[PDB]
């Protein structure tokens, strides 16, 4: 087509979605991790994660307001990944890299799994 | 902080939100324009428009599944702007610029109003 494009549009949209999350506006699901609860927007979770995409496209699960993750999932790893989903920023540290990679593998967040693999390979 | 950032994350999120819109997945509102109906996600509309932000933060309107726009709003202008919201791409043409600018002013989409004003000023 002959469209023009606003370079900062996608980033501004994500920033606003994160402001709605902060203020708990229109959040429609609670993700339960080892008795730690995280409120979020189903559409943002689906846009970022192959696991949430599969869950909320399921005719029965699409209607659930609570999703319980596998008990092996670490709440801090989930929190870091939820922050990444809403900001593009990943708080990756020596002390959390293993939990973050394991959580990204479970959530099916391929780009996160890739950078964790590379950061781990550099330390060996 | 000491975060790393994935450059294409925001764009990939918006692309996935647009794929959900195309497939009518988790859309939670119908916007009615001069008897033309557009299905969308409330959160994306709020992230892009000052008008939708005010509407869906209202305690009564946040619960509506149908929103009727002012009858002076042109459906094509709305369609072009809805596409922009989900893609960052604006189909701005000599034949639609006046309707697009009038719709962007009503929807409170300041960056769109700005480029329309500049494109109109260049033609005078």
């Amino acid at each position: 087509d002959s469209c023009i494009q606003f370079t900062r549009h996608a980033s501004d949209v994500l920033l606003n979605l994160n402001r709605l999350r902060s203020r708990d506006i229109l959040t429609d699901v609670v993700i339960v991790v080892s008795r730690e609860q995280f409120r979020a927007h189903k559409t943002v979770l689906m846009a970022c994660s192959g696991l949430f995409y599969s869950i909320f496209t399921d005719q029965l699960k699409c209607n659930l307001s609570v999703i319980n993750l596998d008990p092996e999932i670490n709440p801090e790893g989930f929190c870091i990944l939820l922050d990444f989903m809403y900001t593009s920023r990943l708080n990756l540290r020596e002390g959390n890299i293993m939990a973050v990679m394991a959580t990204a593998m479970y959530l099916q967040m391929e780009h996160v799994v890739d950078t964790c693999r590379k950061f781990i390979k550099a330390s060996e | 902080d000491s975060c790393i950032q994935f450059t294409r994350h925001a764009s990939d999120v918006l692309l996935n939100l647009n794929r959900l819109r195309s497939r009518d997945i988790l859309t939670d509102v119908v916007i009615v324009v001069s008897r033309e109906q557009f299905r969308a996600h409330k959160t994306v509309l709020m992230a892009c428009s000052g008008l939708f932000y005010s509407i869906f933060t209202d305690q009564l309107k946040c619960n509506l599944s149908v929103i009727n726009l002012d009858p002076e709003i042109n459906p094509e202008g709305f369609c072009i702007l809805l596409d922009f919201m989900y893609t960052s791409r604006l189909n701005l043409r000599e034949g639609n610029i006046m309707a697009v600018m009038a719709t962007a002013m009503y929807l409170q989409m300041e960056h769109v109003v700005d480029t329309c004003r500049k494109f109109i000023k260049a033609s005078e």
């Binding site: 469209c3 023009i4 494009q5 606003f6 370079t7 | 791409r89 604006l90 480029t115």
Partner: peptide, 4 residues
């Protein structure tokens, strides 16, 4: 704004 840019030409994409």
């Amino acid at each position: 704004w840019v030409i994409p």
